[PDB]
Design an enzyme around this catalytic site. Structure first.
Site, PDB file in Angstrom:
ATOM      1  N   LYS A  50      -2.936 -44.335 -41.667  1.00  0.00           N
ATOM      2  CA  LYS A  50      -1.719 -45.118 -41.485  1.00  0.00           C
ATOM      3  C   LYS A  50      -1.672 -45.780 -40.120  1.00  0.00           C
ATOM      4  O   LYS A  50      -0.874 -46.721 -39.909  1.00  0.00           O
ATOM      5  CB  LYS A  50      -0.433 -44.301 -41.672  1.00  0.00           C
ATOM      6  CG  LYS A  50       0.767 -45.213 -41.963  1.00  0.00           C
ATOM      7  CD  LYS A  50       1.991 -44.412 -42.335  1.00  0.00           C
ATOM      8  CE  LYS A  50       3.185 -45.340 -42.387  1.00  0.00           C
ATOM      9  NZ  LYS A  50       3.186 -46.182 -41.168  1.00  0.00           N
ATOM     10  N   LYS A  62      -1.771 -43.278 -51.221  1.00  0.00           N
ATOM     11  CA  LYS A  62      -2.851 -43.428 -52.192  1.00  0.00           C
ATOM     12  C   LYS A  62      -4.120 -42.724 -51.663  1.00  0.00           C
ATOM     13  O   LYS A  62      -4.876 -42.121 -52.424  1.00  0.00           O
ATOM     14  CB  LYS A  62      -3.122 -44.920 -52.507  1.00  0.00           C
ATOM     15  CG  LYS A  62      -2.085 -45.526 -53.461  1.00  0.00           C
ATOM     16  CD  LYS A  62      -2.117 -47.056 -53.535  1.00  0.00           C
ATOM     17  CE  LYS A  62      -1.190 -47.584 -54.658  1.00  0.00           C
ATOM     18  NZ  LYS A  62      -0.009 -48.259 -53.982  1.00  0.00           N
ATOM     19  N   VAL A  93     -15.753 -65.435 -63.929  1.00  0.00           N
ATOM     20  CA  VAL A  93     -16.325 -66.715 -64.273  1.00  0.00           C
ATOM     21  C   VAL A  93     -15.717 -67.793 -63.416  1.00  0.00           C
ATOM     22  O   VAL A  93     -14.480 -68.022 -63.471  1.00  0.00           O
ATOM     23  CB  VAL A  93     -16.065 -67.128 -65.715  1.00  0.00           C
ATOM     24  CG1 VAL A  93     -16.705 -68.517 -65.981  1.00  0.00           C
ATOM     25  CG2 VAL A  93     -16.611 -66.068 -66.677  1.00  0.00           C
ATOM     26  N   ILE A  96     -12.467 -69.856 -63.827  1.00  0.00           N
ATOM     27  CA  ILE A  96     -11.437 -69.132 -64.619  1.00  0.00           C
ATOM     28  C   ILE A  96     -10.749 -68.316 -63.607  1.00  0.00           C
ATOM     29  O   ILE A  96     -11.373 -67.422 -63.015  1.00  0.00           O
ATOM     30  CB  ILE A  96     -11.985 -68.165 -65.702  1.00  0.00           C
ATOM     31  CG1 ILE A  96     -12.707 -68.940 -66.809  1.00  0.00           C
ATOM     32  CG2 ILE A  96     -10.790 -67.365 -66.352  1.00  0.00           C
ATOM     33  CD1 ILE A  96     -13.240 -68.038 -67.920  1.00  0.00           C
ATOM     34  N   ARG A 173     -26.079 -68.654 -39.274  1.00  0.00           N
ATOM     35  CA  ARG A 173     -25.926 -67.531 -38.333  1.00  0.00           C
ATOM     36  C   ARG A 173     -27.163 -66.669 -38.396  1.00  0.00           C
ATOM     37  O   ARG A 173     -27.276 -65.701 -37.682  1.00  0.00           O
ATOM     38  CB  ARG A 173     -24.651 -66.688 -38.596  1.00  0.00           C
ATOM     39  CG  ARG A 173     -23.366 -67.479 -38.375  1.00  0.00           C
ATOM     40  CD  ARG A 173     -22.081 -66.657 -38.309  1.00  0.00           C
ATOM     41  NE  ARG A 173     -22.001 -65.696 -39.388  1.00  0.00           N
ATOM     42  CZ  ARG A 173     -21.475 -65.940 -40.580  1.00  0.00           C
ATOM     43  NH1 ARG A 173     -20.962 -67.120 -40.868  1.00  0.00           N
ATOM     44  NH2 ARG A 173     -21.467 -64.994 -41.495  1.00  0.00           N
ATOM     45  N   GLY A 179     -24.649 -66.463 -50.013  1.00  0.00           N
ATOM     46  CA  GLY A 179     -24.042 -66.565 -51.341  1.00  0.00           C
ATOM     47  C   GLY A 179     -24.134 -67.950 -51.974  1.00  0.00           C
ATOM     48  O   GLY A 179     -23.989 -68.105 -53.174  1.00  0.00           O
ATOM     49  N   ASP A 180     -24.318 -68.978 -51.163  1.00  0.00           N
ATOM     50  CA  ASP A 180     -24.265 -70.368 -51.657  1.00  0.00           C
ATOM     51  C   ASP A 180     -24.840 -71.224 -50.506  1.00  0.00           C
ATOM     52  O   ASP A 180     -25.329 -70.650 -49.516  1.00  0.00           O
ATOM     53  CB  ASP A 180     -22.813 -70.720 -52.023  1.00  0.00           C
ATOM     54  CG  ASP A 180     -21.885 -70.767 -50.805  1.00  0.00           C
ATOM     55  OD1 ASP A 180     -22.303 -70.418 -49.658  1.00  0.00           O
ATOM     56  OD2 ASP A 180     -20.736 -71.218 -50.963  1.00  0.00           O
TER      57      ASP A 180
HETATM   58 MG   LIG Z   1     -19.014 -72.074 -50.003  1.00  0.00          MG
HETATM   59 NA    NA Z   2     -13.157 -67.160 -61.519  1.00  0.00          NA
HETATM   60 NA    NA Z   3      -0.691 -49.170 -39.876  1.00  0.00          NA
END
Ligand SMILES: [Mg+2]
Ligand code: NA
Ligand code: NA
Ligand SMILES: [Mg+2]
Length: 321
Positions: A50, A62, A93, A96, A173, A179-180
């Site tokens: 916390k 939790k 997807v 979507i 970097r 990723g792309d």
């Molecule tokens: Mg991008």
């Molecule tokens: Na999506």
């Molecule tokens: Na906090």
DNA sequence: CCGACGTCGCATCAGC
DNA sequence: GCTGATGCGAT
DNA sequence: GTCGG
């Protein structure tokens, strides 16, 4: 250390965004998952968590439950729910989002299979997302990224030797994979109010040499699509590429922002703020006597920006934060 | 207690 | 036919 | 959900 906690929070994050359509809760959970992932001690109680910024009472509780039982009752339940798990899944997807995923699921369209049978119900972006669902979740090793960059620089310079192109993102970097591919493009003929074919000509040449295979979107400044390296050996996965045409005087702000990382830009924009400067993707602007942003300041390199805010020019390779 | 929590290009929808 | 809203993917 | 005015 705390992987079951950060995985739980991320799983909770996706349901908020994709099922409950509560973007702010999705960001809350991710912020908590972040601060916990960077914390160098096995968490022993929720109260201990916390203390981190972004962990509040509900997440404290939790963590407590996850720690005593190794699960969350709420998460176990949502996971077993047909509607919600499908809605959440379909959003993987590209094209979507939470809202198309909900409509599909409402009408019994739940799996990639159901999507295969129902192409007429899918827009252009969604079919391309479905077509490369698998490929779009693979990462791109640096070596491939370098070959991809070869092709891009060659073909752009070929269309017009006065283009300037920079491949940004984690690749810039020095990251080991990406990723792309994010390519930023400018040209001396393009400033502020100022052809609307400077982008089109580039996309064109890259389709001509079969590097770009599909288009998700394209206008006069931004292109989003798919590319694939040329292959008797195994074909390369299809990859996401974006191409941006930015005016000459915004180009280096653009390059800095799209080099990231996320957090680096967070920190830099913040440090910038306390020196009485505001940096967006386009401009750096000086905050006047009362909080008034004045004129965009002249910029001719990344360094220029780093100067203005009295920061030490950082190599792209040291920009995790 | 209660509002902020990123912002924008492009595709496509809803409404006129 | 046009205009503005909405959905999406995003450093 | 968390933060903070
Ligand atoms: Mg991008
Ligand atoms: Na999506
Ligand atoms: Na906090
Ligand atoms: Mg020339």
């Amino acid at each position: 250390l705390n992987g079951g906690i950060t995985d739980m929070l991320t799983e909770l994050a996706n349901f908020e965004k994709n099922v409950s359509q509560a973007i702010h809760k999705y960001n809350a959970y991710r912020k908590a998952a972040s601060v916990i992932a960077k914390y160098p001690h096995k968490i022993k109680s929720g109260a201990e968590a916390k203390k981190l910024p972004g962990v509040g009472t509900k997440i404290a509780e939790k963590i407590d439950e996850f720690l005593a039982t190794g699960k969350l009752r709420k998460l176990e339940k949502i996971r077993q729910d047909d509607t919600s798990s499908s809605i959440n899944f379909l959003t993987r997807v590209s094209g979507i989002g939470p809202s198309a995923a909900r409509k599909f699921v409402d009408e019994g369209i739940k799996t990639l299979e159901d999507l295969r049978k129902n192409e007429d119900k899918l827009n252009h972006h969604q079919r391309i997302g479905l077509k490369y669902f698998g490929d779009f979740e693979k990462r791109i090793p640096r070596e491939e990224m370098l070959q991809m960059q070869d092709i891009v620089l060659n073909e752009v310079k070929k269309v017009d030797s006065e283009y300037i192109a920079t491949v940004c993102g984690s690749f810039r970097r020095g990251a080991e994979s990406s990723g792309d591919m994010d390519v930023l493009l400018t040209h001396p003929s393009f400033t502020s109010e100022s052809q609307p074919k400077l982008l089109h000509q580039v996309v064109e040449q890259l389709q001509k040499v079969h590097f770009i295979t599909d288009t998700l979107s394209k206008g006069e400044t931004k292109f989003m699509g798919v590319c694939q390296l040329p292959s008797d050996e195994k074909e390369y996965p299809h990859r996401r590429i974006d191409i941006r045409l930015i005016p000459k005087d915004q180009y280096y702000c653009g390059v800095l922002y799209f080099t990231g990382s996320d957090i680096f830009n967070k920190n830099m924009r913040a440090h910038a703020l306390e020196k009485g400067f505001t940096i967006n993707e386009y401009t750096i602007r000086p905050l006047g006597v009362t909080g008034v942003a004045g004129e965009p300041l002249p910029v001719d390199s990344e360094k220029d920006i780093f100067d203005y805010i009295q920061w030490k020019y950082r190599e792209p390779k040291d920009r995790s934060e």
